[PDB]
Amino acid sequence: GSHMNRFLTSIVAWLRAGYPEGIPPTDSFAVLALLCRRLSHDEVKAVANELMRLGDFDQIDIGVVITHFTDELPSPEDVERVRARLAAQGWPLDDVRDREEHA
Structure with a gap:
C-alpha cells in the first residue's frame, strides 16, 4: 500500500x-x-515550490541554485x-538501521 x-x-x-x-535564505x-x-533537483524544486506556496519557506529561488550551484556556497556552517x-525531527534523508546506535 504505497502512495x-x-x-x-x-x-x-x-x-x-x-x-x-x-527557514532563513542562508x-x-x-x-x-x-x-x-x-x-533529484526537479523533485526538490517541486517540493520547494509547493512548500513556499504553503508558507513554511522563505520566498527565494531554490530552483535556480539546485540547477545552477555556487562554487563557494552553500555555506558549510549552514x-x-x-x-x-x-536531525531533531528525524532523518529520512539518509538510511538508518533500526538498532540502538546513537541516542
Missing part, C-alpha cells in the same frame, strides 16, 4: 518541522544541498546547521 503523494507531504512536514519559525540553500542528496536542527 507517492503522501511521501512528498511527509517531506514537506519534516522540512518545515525543522524550522517552525521559517540555510535554505543548506536545505537544498542536503535534500539534493536524496531527491549545511551543518540545518543538519543539526533537522
Whole structure:
C-alpha cells in the first residue's frame, strides 16, 4: 500500500518541522544541498515550490541554485546547521538501521 503523494507531504512536514519559525535564505540553500542528496533537483524544486506556496519557506529561488550551484556556497556552517536542527525531527534523508546506535 504505497502512495507517492503522501511521501512528498511527509517531506514537506519534516522540512518545515525543522524550522517552525521559517527557514532563513542562508540555510535554505543548506536545505537544498542536503535534500539534493536524496531527491533529484526537479523533485526538490517541486517540493520547494509547493512548500513556499504553503508558507513554511522563505520566498527565494531554490530552483535556480539546485540547477545552477555556487562554487563557494552553500555555506558549510549552514549545511551543518540545518543538519543539526533537522536531525531533531528525524532523518529520512539518509538510511538508518533500526538498532540502538546513537541516542
